[PDB]
Design a protein around this ligand. Structure first.
Ligand SMILES: CC1(C)S[C@H]([C@H](NC(=O)[C@H](N)c2ccccc2)C(=O)O)N[C@H]1C(=O)O
Length: 266
């Protein structure tokens, strides 16, 4: 199936001027499409989806974790925190911080949740616990977004991202109530309208999480998509480029997603 689209993926990344990694799986048939899917790509803000999943996991053991109010000072605010800066004088709940991290990629919210989890190693440990041996988070916002060529810090692979997303949203990695909360947060994402969501028909349900390091042409998107009356598809699209000033392209991510779905037979 990978062969059907191997040549157009190569042509897409040559027009982009960088590297594109794609993994997609039809949960109905088990068919997969794989292009650079085991290479490492920077996570950028896309780690925040797994962060929310790790918070939900903890909430299974800790009653009421999601409703805990978190107060923070202005020193907790980091650039591009569009939600948490509006509640600085009041605070927010863990559930609100998690939704802000997922749906608005709120940086301060992400750092606040990371600290509750034990930092980047705490999130890495969560991914190890669901069977993901590729994921690694090493730094906090905004330092994790340096996207340096060859640097394995703060990276995963498109295949590992897709397999983990599948376990968390469709498998048994989360208990049923927590699993549906994770899916609903992904479905309410506001930052991905020009990436995987631009690639699917209007009647499909989509939950996604985007990432944008910006430098080194580095950006990404991962998603669970539900074709109407049909089994869900899970996919991840990651990009990078050789030069620090290379620009990222949402259009390229959408185009890669389109090819992956075409390769799956949709
Ligand atoms: C929330 C952010 C605006 S900053 C955060 C971070 N990226 C950066 O710090 C980049 N230097 C940046 C890219 C675009 C706009 C502003 C900053 C990351 O990928 O984790 N992701 C960006 C995003 O996902 O939109």
């Amino acid at each position: 199936l990978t062969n059907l689209v191997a040549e157009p993926f190569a042509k897409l990344e040559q027009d982009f001027g960088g590297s594109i990694g794609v993994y997609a799986m039809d949960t109905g048939s088990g068919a997969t499409v794989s292009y650079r899917a085991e290479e490492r790509f920077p996570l950028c803000s896309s780690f925040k989806g797994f962060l929310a999943a790790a918070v939900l996991a903890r909430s299974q053991q800790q009653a009421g974790l999601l409703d805990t109010p978190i107060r923070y000072g202005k020193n907790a605010l980091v650039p591009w925190s569009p939600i948490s800066e509006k509640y600085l004088t009041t605070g927010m709940t863990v559930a609100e911080l998690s939704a802000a991290a997922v749906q608005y990629s709120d940086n301060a919210a992400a750092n606040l949740l990371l600290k509750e989890l034990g930092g980047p190693a705490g999130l890495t440990a969560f991914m190890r616990s669901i069977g993901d041996t590729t994921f690694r988070l090493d730094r906090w916002e905004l330092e994790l977004a340096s996207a340096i060529p060859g640097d394995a810090r703060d990276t995963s692979s498109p295949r590992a991202v897709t397999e983990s997303l599948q376990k968390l949203t469709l498998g048994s990695a989360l208990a049923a109530p927590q699993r549906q909360q994770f899916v609903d947060w992904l479905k309410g994402n506001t930052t991905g309208n020009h990436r995987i969501r631009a690639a699917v028909p209007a009647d499909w349900a989509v939950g996604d999480k985007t990432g944008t390091c910006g430098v080194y042409g580095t950006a990404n998107d991962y998603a669970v998509v539900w074709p109407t009356g049909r089994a869900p598809i899970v996919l991840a699209v990651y990009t990078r480029a050789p030069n620090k000033d290379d620009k990222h392209s949402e259009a390229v991510i959408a185009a890669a997603a389109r090819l992956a779905l075409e390769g799956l037979g949709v």
